[PDB]
Design a protein around this ligand. Structure first.
Ligand SMILES: CC(=O)N[C@@H](Cc1ccc(OP(=O)(O)O)cc1)C(=O)N[C@@H](CCC(=O)O)C(=O)N[C@H](CCC1CCCCC1)C(N)=O
Length: 102
């Protein structure tokens, strides 16, 4: 239940997002399974080559500071990241739209 999904798997994230009900920009935030201390923004997309597909963006945190996907654009928290990208794609595949249901 969203937007923070905590310790779900990459593949489980993907199975959730890829519900055909879900529009482009459907998203969740999870822990990164593989980088410890990182988080992950997982977003549903579409192209006519791949069809329905998902992109994953690592969210790093500086020790000393803020959260980021790109290091020139930082946030003092995860809700501020999410609020930003809800208004602007700014290099993401798509603007954040629905939170992932379930
Ligand atoms: C295999 C994979 O998904 N890697 C992920 C990263 C990841 C790793 C571990 C995670 O943790 P976990 O193991 O739990 O999933 C979660 C996510 C990945 O590279 N995404 C791509 C972007 C999505 C895509 O275009 O696909 C990525 O960073 N692009 C970078 C940077 C691109 C830019 C684009 C402009 C805005 C700032 C980012 C690159 N190439 O310069």
């Amino acid at each position: 239940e969203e937007w923070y999904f905590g310790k779900i798997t990459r593949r489980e994230s993907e199975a959730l997002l890829l519900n055909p009900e879900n529009p482009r920009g459907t998203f969740l935030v999870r822990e990164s399974e593989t980088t410890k201390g990182a988080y992950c923004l997982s977003v549903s997309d579409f192209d006519n080559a791949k069809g329905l597909n998902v992109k994953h963006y690592k969210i790093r945190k500086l020790d000393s500071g803020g959260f980021y996907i790109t290091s020139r654009t930082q946030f003092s928290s995860l809700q501020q990241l999410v609020a930003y990208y809800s208004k602007h794609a700014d290099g993401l595949c798509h603007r954040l739209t629905n939170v992932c249901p379930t």
